[PDB]
Amino acid sequence: SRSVWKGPNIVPLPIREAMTKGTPIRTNARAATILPQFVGLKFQIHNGKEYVPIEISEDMVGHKLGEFAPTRKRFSYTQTKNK
Amino acid sequence: MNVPKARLLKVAELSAKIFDQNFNPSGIRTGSKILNERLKGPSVASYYGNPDILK
């Protein structure tokens, strides 16, 4: 956990266009902190291959952006291993 | 520790002024260590030697 006195992790994002025009924000900044001003905004978070669209909620505030954009999908085992 | 703290801190800041030293009685985060850290750029830059060696 980042020290509180340092302040939240902050990154330049096109928030003005999203607040007024409603354009979704597409970013690779998965380490940015969801500030309370991002509630109700449409984000699209990179995951290495594709940008996952999510809309920030009140409960998500304070978390990081990449916490909702999984990078590797669920592990599965092919039972019919054969040989 | 019978001596009052007021006397001890009076000696503390007097010495600090004499010896050109910081005095932060409250212990707040002044960030002094950031500035006082040495610059290592000259040494890190010459890791691969003199680029002007005769060829």
């Binding site: 330049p12 | 002044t30 750029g41 691969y48």
Partner: protein
Amino acid sequence: GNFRFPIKTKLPPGFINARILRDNFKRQQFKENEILVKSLKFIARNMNLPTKLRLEAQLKLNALPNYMRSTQIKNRCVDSGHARFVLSDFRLCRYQFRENALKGNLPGVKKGIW
């Protein structure tokens, strides 16, 4: 006319490999503006200054290109370019410190016996 990096830097005299060139460029750029990084880090971590100053300082730190971060620098073998088991006393990788040592290239190194 198509230099791989924004600033035209000189070339190392010894062994050169693409990776070395990258690391060397990072070294020179970090050296150039390490004072700026230190000043910005001070402001962004100072609660005695207005929070706007902290905000802009943090913003400008986050915007600095990768080639000004000290953390980016990785020590490499100056004779082979390998970036594992590099001994700072010689800047030589493993098996190149050994080879050169046996050759007697290193000023005082010896075969360990005790």
